[PDB]
Design a protein around this motif. Structure first.
Motif, PDB file in Angstrom:
ATOM      1  N   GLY B 120      36.500  86.682  66.445  1.00  0.00           N
ATOM      2  CA  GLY B 120      37.934  86.509  66.355  1.00  0.00           C
ATOM      3  C   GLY B 120      38.453  85.169  66.861  1.00  0.00           C
ATOM      4  O   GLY B 120      39.577  84.779  66.530  1.00  0.00           O
ATOM      5  N   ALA B 173      41.512  86.265  64.341  1.00  0.00           N
ATOM      6  CA  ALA B 173      41.092  87.493  63.634  1.00  0.00           C
ATOM      7  C   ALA B 173      40.875  88.663  64.578  1.00  0.00           C
ATOM      8  O   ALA B 173      39.840  89.329  64.527  1.00  0.00           O
ATOM      9  CB  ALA B 173      39.834  87.209  62.799  1.00  0.00           C
ATOM     10  N   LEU B 312      47.642  92.209  61.551  1.00  0.00           N
ATOM     11  CA  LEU B 312      46.394  91.977  60.836  1.00  0.00           C
ATOM     12  C   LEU B 312      45.334  93.057  60.963  1.00  0.00           C
ATOM     13  O   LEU B 312      45.206  93.799  61.930  1.00  0.00           O
ATOM     14  CB  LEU B 312      45.835  90.632  61.258  1.00  0.00           C
ATOM     15  CG  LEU B 312      44.752  90.199  62.183  1.00  0.00           C
ATOM     16  CD1 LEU B 312      43.351  90.733  61.917  1.00  0.00           C
ATOM     17  CD2 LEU B 312      44.659  88.645  62.176  1.00  0.00           C
ATOM     18  N   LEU B 314      41.008  93.794  59.711  1.00  0.00           N
ATOM     19  CA  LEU B 314      39.708  93.308  59.314  1.00  0.00           C
ATOM     20  C   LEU B 314      38.912  94.474  58.698  1.00  0.00           C
ATOM     21  O   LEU B 314      38.580  95.388  59.465  1.00  0.00           O
ATOM     22  CB  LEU B 314      38.938  92.811  60.526  1.00  0.00           C
ATOM     23  CG  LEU B 314      38.502  91.376  60.729  1.00  0.00           C
ATOM     24  CD1 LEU B 314      37.417  91.308  61.811  1.00  0.00           C
ATOM     25  CD2 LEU B 314      38.022  90.669  59.467  1.00  0.00           C
ATOM     26  N   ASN B 341      35.882  86.886  56.121  1.00  0.00           N
ATOM     27  CA  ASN B 341      35.970  86.616  57.551  1.00  0.00           C
ATOM     28  C   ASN B 341      34.826  87.331  58.257  1.00  0.00           C
ATOM     29  O   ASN B 341      34.538  88.492  57.919  1.00  0.00           O
ATOM     30  CB  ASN B 341      37.321  87.144  58.065  1.00  0.00           C
ATOM     31  CG  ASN B 341      37.659  86.556  59.425  1.00  0.00           C
ATOM     32  OD1 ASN B 341      38.598  85.754  59.506  1.00  0.00           O
ATOM     33  ND2 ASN B 341      36.940  86.898  60.478  1.00  0.00           N
ATOM     34  N   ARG B 357      39.692  89.481  55.935  1.00  0.00           N
ATOM     35  CA  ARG B 357      40.821  89.506  56.864  1.00  0.00           C
ATOM     36  C   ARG B 357      42.092  89.655  56.047  1.00  0.00           C
ATOM     37  O   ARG B 357      42.252  88.989  55.018  1.00  0.00           O
ATOM     38  CB  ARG B 357      40.874  88.231  57.712  1.00  0.00           C
ATOM     39  CG  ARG B 357      42.045  88.203  58.700  1.00  0.00           C
ATOM     40  CD  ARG B 357      42.112  86.820  59.361  1.00  0.00           C
ATOM     41  NE  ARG B 357      42.556  85.811  58.382  1.00  0.00           N
ATOM     42  CZ  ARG B 357      42.885  84.563  58.743  1.00  0.00           C
ATOM     43  NH1 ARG B 357      42.859  84.192  60.035  1.00  0.00           N
ATOM     44  NH2 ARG B 357      43.245  83.719  57.772  1.00  0.00           N
TER      45      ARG B 357
END
Ligand SMILES: Cc1ncc(COP(=O)(O)O)c(CNCC(=O)O)c1O
Ligand SMILES: Cc1ncc(COP(=O)(O)O)c(CNCC(=O)O)c1O
Lengths: 405, 405
Positions: B120, B173, B312, B314, B341, B357
């Motif tokens: 991240g 991230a 966000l 992932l 990502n 992502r």
């Protein structure tokens, strides 16, 4: 403007004052200019909206097909303008353009040879309060004490003595043509790279009024906003051989996502510079500077180096017993904007100085010609020779207002 | 636009394609957003035109009276938004904001502790091909292999072992809330400064939907363009005690003249964020991300950390036997923009990855709600679960087009 006035009256009022100020004053700061409405429209576009780390066709995000066209237009127009093998149009400023070249060629602590900062060198050329001077070991070459012209024997002796890994040529306050061929000959003698920072003279180079550094230098850096009359930002030009290293110095090296809207404005300014009327504009800039220089000497002023070969001039105010700080303040009272600036071998500190730096790129953009240069010089003579007279100051104010409408 | 179309048809055609593209696609890149017309109008203004090295009331050029108002509006609105003792609104980008903090607190070669880049952490947090990793000695802390939540015992063990001069918290991230109080407690334990890079979550912090790092960190950096929905550029927030050093790090330290037009757009975006409807927007961003996360898990997707606390998410694509690179390419074929990502402990390299992502700030700005999030997740399920079916791809395309109009 349509949405700004309603959404943010405070910011819109301040911007509108700034716009009116730009029209009402006589702008003589050598690094300023006025961009076209097309350049402004490109930077006020939705391109702000895109992440585009990487380069055209080699991005780290999808959807860059159309910003890639814009970036390629900028790079190809740049190459047509300057004849360079590669261009990088991502530098956020003149400082980042220089920082990236330094990151490419130097290791922390390496020796760099640049122009003495109180003789015309820029802040990004070794100032000890700047990253350039903190990260690397800068040594300087100076101008002759009488002609104020770069002393090429001094450039060579300093190169041979200090053995720099890089030599930087060019300046923020040098009124004469720079001999890039001699700089390259010295760099080769000592095995150093040559970087030319042409930020102040880029537009003159583009119009063929100043020798182009591209054929002599390994790296050429510049601001896109001074004589080149583009948006505020930087650019690096270089031989094909350093292309990949310079691109990587910019990203993933020292920046992140590029300003694509600004890159679009760069392309627009590059398109304008490629046209014939920009060549005629640049000629007027240089013609105007000579006229202004001659007219100032007619008033009794001494000029550093005795005149100018480009867009700028430096007045040595010692004969009038004025510091640059005093002259800048009193010119500001009548509507004339200049910068105080050290002169070679100045007895005063950089915060006081014995000179004022002046350039004609901005007033030439607004349409001023040789007759206006004669009047501006007569106004500066009236003011600087009568600093304690409020009547002279008031007359000057009325004469400035007659020029700006 | 009025002058651009006539002056430069080539650049205007490309910008117009980019504008239409922005409307036609489903933008899920977590760092993107769409700014208001007022922000664009401020950056397309004549403020480009001014040199303003230095700060409000302390400039190195005359005539800055009106750009000083604009810069002060930006700094004071920033301080009202985040409650910081000082703001610096000159950073040209998120990268320059971080570079200036590093230039302020570190000597070349100093040790810095930041978030693992494949867990991240951002590129400007130690990448060896970035200035951060080239100039300083970066060491990293990771997330737990199962919960994917920062392992604060690991942050502490790494701090105590490596004795960093600075600790960096935050990411590009990381889908969960970051505990700034624990980061500050560790920094104090080892006598390190704490820097929080809140670039991705600034808008959420502003709306009170993410704990504010300001009270815990010596320095807070950010981009002004992601959840904060401002123009592309950076900002540094800091305690009064480092105010002068941070200002000097920016200028004369690492930049030159600031982009005053962009600083005006920053103030405009800060004004928008101070309003109640921006708080309601931010809430929708987070609500939308949760909805989308839940809807994606309903489709069978595994999410890193099991969901999200911010804007966000992932997706760990291992269960579907897809690399992030493949999923990004096939989503691009149907009009859905995402980024590949790495996921924590990814078996694939950063150029291939096992994840995508996704963020909701952009689609929330365009008006998408919970029902749209349900449809986007159903579209992604159809595509990623049927990668070899052109019929699934065509249906997805028609469903994307129904969302974007
Ligand atoms: C020769 C030269 N090189 C770099 C800069 C820095 O550009 P920036 O966009 O401000 O980072 C300059 C700046 N000149 C400004 C002035 O002389 O007034 C420069 O001249
Ligand atoms: C946490 C974080 N910090 C700095 C940057 C660099 O900003 P820039 O304006 O691009 O120099 C970023 C960039 N994030 C872009 C992305 O995640 O897509 C960042 O996240």
């Amino acid at each position: 403007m349509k949405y700004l006035p309603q959404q943010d009256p405070q910011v819109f009022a301040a911007i509108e004052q700034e716009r009116k100020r730009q029209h009402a004053k006589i702008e003589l700061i050598a690094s300023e200019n006025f961009v076209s409405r097309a350049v402004m429209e490109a930077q006020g576009s939705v391109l702000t909206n895109k992440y585009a780390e990487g380069y055209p066709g080699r991005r780290y995000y999808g959807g860059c097909e159309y910003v890639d066209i814009v970036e390629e237009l900028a790079r190809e127009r740049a190459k047509q303008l300057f004849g360079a093998e590669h261009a990088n149009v991502q530098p956020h400023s003149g400082a980042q353009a220089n920082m990236a070249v330094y990151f490419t060629v130097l290791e922390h602590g390496d020796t760099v040879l640049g122009m003495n900062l109180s003789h015309g060198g820029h802040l990004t050329h070794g100032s000890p309060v700047n990253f350039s001077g903190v990260q690397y070991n800068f040594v300087a070459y100076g101008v002759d004490p009488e002609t104020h012209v770069i002393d090429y024997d001094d450039v060579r002796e300093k190169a041979r003595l200090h053995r720099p890994k890089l030599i930087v040529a060019a300046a923020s306050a040098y009124p004469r043509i720079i001999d890039f061929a001699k700089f390259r000959e010295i760099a080769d003698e000592v095995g150093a790279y040559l970087m030319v920072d042409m930020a102040h003279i880029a537009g003159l180079v583009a119009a063929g009024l100043h020798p182009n550094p591209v054929p002599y230098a390994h790296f050429v850096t510049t601001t896109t906003h001074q004589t080149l009359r583009g948006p505020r930002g930087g650019m690096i030009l270089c031989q094909e051989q350093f292309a990949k290293q310079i691109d990587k110095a910019i990203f993933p090296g020292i920046q992140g996502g590029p300003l694509m809207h600004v890159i679009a404005a760069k392309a627009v300014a590059f398109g304008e510079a490629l046209q014939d009327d920009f060549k005629a504009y640049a000629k007027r800039v240089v013609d105007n500077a000579k006229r202004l220089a001659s007219a100032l000497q007619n008033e009794g002023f001494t000029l550093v180096s005795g005149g100018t070969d480009n867009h700028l001039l430096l007045v040595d105010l010692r004969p009038q017993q004025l510091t640059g700080k005093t002259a800048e303040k009193v010119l500001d009272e009548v509507g004339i904007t200049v910068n105080k600036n050290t002169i070679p071998y100045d007895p005063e500190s950089p915060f006081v100085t014995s000179g004022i730096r002046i350039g004609t790129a901005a007033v030439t953009t607004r349409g001023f010609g040789l007759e206006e240069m004669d009047e501006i010089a007569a106004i500066i003579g009236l003011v600087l020779k009568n600093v304690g007279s409020e009547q002279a100051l008031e007359e000057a104010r009325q004469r400035v207002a007659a020029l700006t409408d």
